[PDB]
Each structure stands twice: as structure tokens, then as C-alpha cells.
Amino acid sequence: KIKPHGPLPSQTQLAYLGDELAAFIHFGPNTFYDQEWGTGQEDPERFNPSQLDAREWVRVLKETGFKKLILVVKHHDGFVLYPTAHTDYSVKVSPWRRGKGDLLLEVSQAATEFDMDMGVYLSPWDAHSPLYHVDREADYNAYYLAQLKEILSNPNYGNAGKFAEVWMNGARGEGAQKVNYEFEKWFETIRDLQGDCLIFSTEGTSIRWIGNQRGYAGDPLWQKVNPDKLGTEAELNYLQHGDPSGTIFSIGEADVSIRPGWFYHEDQDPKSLEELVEIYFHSVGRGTPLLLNIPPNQAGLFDAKDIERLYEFATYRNELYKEDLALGAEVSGPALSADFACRHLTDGLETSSWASDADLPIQLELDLGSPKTFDVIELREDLKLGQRIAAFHVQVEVDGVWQEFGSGHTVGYKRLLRGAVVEAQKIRVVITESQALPLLTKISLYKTP
């Protein structure tokens, strides 16, 4: 047996890493006020998306490869998009659905139909609530917690009653009240109702912020941190790269809007395909999920251009992965045992993996059997045994000279590394630094479309 190394991921964490793509939905009063942050003074009468079709949101996301939908149900403005018992500042007083509307239910029904996992974003900062004050913070915490209970205990919310992620945004305006949150009590309730449901927060939960809203994970990206170096004043580079000596497994989730803003603005356009592809390689291609925000318009529909762009992005990915040019390639180099043999890297069996306790550097050489043309290499670690690799490089033989293809720090769950398009038959993967004996589950090669 190989012993584990470092902090190990939970099954829910591994599941998210495997899923890769999640969608965010920011929609609410801000959409009608053409703004990014609201004050809590917005008029509920303005909230009337009469053409809203939550099933279309879910259908398009499902068809374009998203595996989770994180819905904003209360942004910083404090307007609640389901009929909570706990405030009057909700859809109950809006004309939408004649006051009888429940956006969390509408989305949940569609998600259940499509087997789309659900997340829920409930803003800690609340610019509306009279309880949002240091002098009333116990009451505000009870309000927040009561809403968690309403959302997470109702079998009609979630994907068949299940939530996969809870989002606790760390943002608060200059000159807001400095309310402190009862995080542990909140986390306890989340477990009680939803088990190992992932939580995004400023604290030492299973998901952290990557430290930017550009969709950019660092290299290295260690999916681990020490919770005592988080909080609202966590260093951006600490979030972006993680901690080589981290004590908990932590996914640095890469959130980014398809538009400049999180909410829909008529005068904005979605990112180009080119732009989304760069994001993809720097998020999913660095071993962390991409959480891409798609904001419905004032009608309650995704914008036509955004929809087109999501199908274009899905096509791109489907084409990228159409053929693994490394499948069945002969692999040589050191290997711990037959059970961890080199051939496990290209055998297309996800139940087989390679490992070596040899001295570094470790050099794996692939022979594709004939010259093939590629510009992407994919490597994967076995994170059930912990993240280990800290430096590697790749070379390709060109006219009898071993030339560089590219280099990196970490591998993680999955690392895509691009290089110049090359026609080659022999490739070397060289592991040069690792915290423990390296394991890899797969080496793949692709040509970008």
C-alpha cells in the first residue's frame, strides 16, 4: 500500500472536481435598477420578470455541460427571492406571479427534472435588514440561520431536496455595520440538514475564493490551506496558489461572470469564445472548477448572445476532448510495482494508476507508435492519496532533439498544459519536485480545435 500524503479531499470535494463546471445566476432588483450593488431601498414593485422561464435556464445550462447551478436568493440589497417567513422584503410583496412567486422553487423544480445539482447564495451582508447592526447581531445571526433552515430543510428545494453548495459571500461595503457572524452554528445547521454539502466562505470551509473574479487560478495551485490564514484579510496570492503546507483540503473555486458585471446590463456583451477558452485553461486546466455567472435579463430570460456563446463553448470543449492521442501509447520509466505500472497512464482504465518511489527526477517517456499532432497535454494525480507534485516539465522529440513543450508547478486533480502545435511520436513527462512519491492516473494528449 501507498500511504496518504497531506490533507485528503472529501467525497463531495472530489465530486465537484470531477464535475468541473458550475453556473452562477445573479438576478434580482439589481437587474431592474441596472446596477451591481443595491441599497435595500429598491422598490419591490419594480421586480416583475413576466416572461421568466427557470426551466429554460436549467435546460440551456444542462445542454451546455454545467453540472451545478448556484442561485442567488438574496444579494447584498437583502431582497429575498423566495417567500421566506422571516422578512417582508421578499417576492411576496412584488407583482411577479401576483405575489405568489418562489424563484427557488421554480429553479429547484427544473433542476430536479434535469438532475442539475443546486447551490444557494444567501448574502451575509444585508443592507435592508433592521437587524444588521452590531447592537442586534445576535438577532441578525438568528435571521440568517432561520433562512438557512427554510432553504435547506424543504424537500421541494434543491435537486430532489439536496443542495451541493452554500455560498457565503465575504463582500461588505465601506461604512456598513461590522456585524460578526456565528459561522460555526451556521455550519452545524448546514451539516444537520445537508451532510457534507460544500460551503464557500471566508473561513476554513471546503471551498475558498481563488482571490480574483477573472477565472484565474495560480500556478502552483495547492488545493489546501491553513484556516488560520484565511478570513476577510486573507492574502490574494494565498487564495490563488493555496499553501504547500496547508492543513485542510480546500478547493479554490474560480468564479467569473460571462459579462463585465454579475447582473444583466443591456449595454454589456458576453465574453468572446477566445476569452472563455483562456479562462477554461486557467481554471479547469489548473485543477479547479469554473463557476461561470450567466445573468437573466429583465424579462427573466438568458440573453440570446450569452446562450449562443455557451453552446459555442460546449462545442469547443467537446471537440478538444474528441480524441486522446495518447490512448494505448507505450510508456516506459520507473514504476513501484505491476499494480502501479506505467501502462496504467494510457490504458483508458480510470481504475488503474502509476506510482514510483524512484529518486527524482522521474522521467516517463511515451511512444505514440506513429507521429501525431497535438498542442495539449493532460496529467492527473490521485488526490484520494493527497496532492504531491510541485514541479514538472514536458518535452517532445523533434528531429532527434528533445525540445521543450512546457513546464509547470502543480498537477492536482487535472492539469492541462498547452504548448506550440507539434508533430511528434515521443514525449517525456519529467517530475522534478514532489512532496511524496508521485502518483498519476492518466496522461492524455489533445489538439485544440
Ligand X SMILES: CC(=O)N[C@@H]1[C@@H](O[C@@H]2O[C@@H](C)[C@@H](O)[C@@H](O)[C@@H]2O)[C@H](O[C@@H]2O[C@H](CO)[C@H](O)[C@H](O)[C@H]2O[C@@H]2O[C@@H](C)[C@@H](O)[C@@H](O)[C@@H]2O)[C@@H](CO)O[C@@H]1O
> Which three-class secondary structure state does DSSP give residue 240?
helix
Examine residue 192 and tell whether it contacts a second copy (CB under 8 A): no
Residues 375-414 that bind ligand X (CB under 6 A): 401, 403-404
Shortest spacing between CB 226 and a second copy, in angstroms: 16
Number of neighbours of residue 50 by Cβ within 10 angstroms = 10
CA neighbours within 13 Å on the CB side: how many for 368? 20
| Antiparallel, parallel or unpaired: β 117-122 and 68-74 | parallel
Shortest spacing between CB 184 and a second copy, in angstroms: 28
Provide the 8-state DSSP code for 4.
Answer: P
**Nearest-angstrom CA–CA distance, 57 and 334:** 49
Examine residue 172 and tell whether it contacts a second copy (CB under 8 A): no
Q: 26 or 224: whose CB is closer to ligand X?
A: 26
**Nearest-angstrom CA–CA distance, 142 and 128:** 16
**Nearest-angstrom CA–CA distance, 47 and 30:** 9
Examine residue 212 and tell whether it contacts a second copy (CB under 8 A): yes
Residues 229-268 that bind a second copy (CB under 8 A): 235-237, 240, 260
Residue nearest to ligand X (CB): 170
For 187, the enclosing helix (H) or strand (E) is: helix 183-194
Q: What are phi and psi of 439, to 5 degrees?
A: -120, 145
| Antiparallel, parallel or unpaired: β 198-200 and 401-408 | unpaired
Q: 63 or 404: whose CB is closer to ligand X?
A: 404
Q: 200 or 340: whose CB is closer to ligand X?
A: 200
Examine residue 237 and tell whether it contacts ligand X (CB under 6 A): no
Examine residue 282 and tell whether it contacts a second copy (CB under 8 A): no
255 binds, among ligand X, a second copy, none (CB under 5 to 8 A by kind): ligand X
Per CB under 6 A, the list member of 255, 303, 306, 382 interacting with ligand X is 255
Examine residue 50 and tell whether it contacts ligand X (CB under 6 A): no
- Residue 5 assigned as binding residue: no
Provide the 8-state DSSP code for 129.
Answer: -
Shortest spacing between CB 172 and ligand X, in angstroms: 6
DSSP characters over 402-437: EEEEEEES--TT-EEEEEEEEEEEEEEEEEEEESSS
- Residue 129 assigned as binding residue: no
List for the chain the helix, strand, coil content (%; round to 5): 30, 25, 45
Q: Which residues bind a second copy (CB under 8 A)?
A: 35-37, 211-214, 235-237, 240, 260, 391, 393, 398-401, 403-404, 406-407, 409, 420, 432-433
**Which stretches of the chain bind ligand X, using CB under 6 A?**
36-37, 169-172, 202, 209, 213, 232, 255, 262, 401, 403-404
